């Protein structure tokens, strides 16, 4: 029902499994052919990733107007790399 994603600095995010599957990488890291530890993604990055998962699951295929996904300037470069690795 849920899963745990752990940042490099130790924070633990419990997110629903369906939401996490939004990431192909995670869908493979786990459920490969529970938990997942990301030694390269920091707390201020992984918190945004999880927020994007709820955002994505809530708005895809929706007639209701969609709001912008906000991204602060300082988080942009690292979020980009995190996003690139997670395939989402």
Partner 1 sequence: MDVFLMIRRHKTTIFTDAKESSTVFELKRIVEGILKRPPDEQRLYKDDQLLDDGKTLGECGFTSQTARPQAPATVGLAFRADDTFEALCIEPFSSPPE
Partner 2 sequence: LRSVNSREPSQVIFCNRSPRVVLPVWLNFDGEPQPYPTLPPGTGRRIHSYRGHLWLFRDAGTHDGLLVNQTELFVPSLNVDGQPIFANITLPVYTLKERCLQVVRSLVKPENYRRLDIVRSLYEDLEDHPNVQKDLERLTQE
CA distance 36 to 14: 11
Rounded least distance, CB 33 to partner 1, Å = 27
Report which of 44, 46, 50 is spatially closest to residue 73, judged by C-alpha positions.
44
Query: Which does residue 38 bind out of partner 2, partner 1, none, counting CB within 5 to 8 angstroms by kind?
Result: none
* Window 2 to 61, contacts with partner 2 (CB under 8 A): 49, 52, 55-56, 59-60
Cα separation values, 77 from 41, 73, 82, Å: 12, 8, 9
Rounded least distance, CB 59 to partner 1, Å = 7
Do 86 and 26 contact (CB within 8 A), yes or no?
yes
CA distance 24 to 74: 26
Contact between 69 and partner 2 by CB under 8 A: the answer reads yes
Residue 5 is classified by DSSP as E
Site for partner 1, rule CB under 8 A? 1-2, 7-16, 19, 42-45, 47, 50-55, 57-59, 67, 69-70, 72-75, 78
Site for partner 2, rule CB under 8 A? 49, 52, 55-56, 59-60, 63, 65-69, 71, 73, 76-77, 79-81, 83-84, 86, 88
């Amino acid at each position: 029902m849920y899963v745990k994603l752990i940042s490099s600095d130790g924070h633990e995010f419990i997110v629903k499994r369906e939401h996490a599957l939004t990431s192909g990488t995670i869908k493979a890291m786990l459920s490969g052919p529970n938990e997942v530890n990301f030694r390269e993604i920091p707390s201020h990055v992984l918190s945004k990733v999880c927020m994007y998962f709820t955002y994505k699951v809530r708005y895809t295929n929706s007639s209701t107007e969609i709001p912008e996904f906000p991204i602060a300037p300082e988080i942009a470069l690292e979020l980009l790399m995190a996003a690139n690795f997670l395939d989402c």
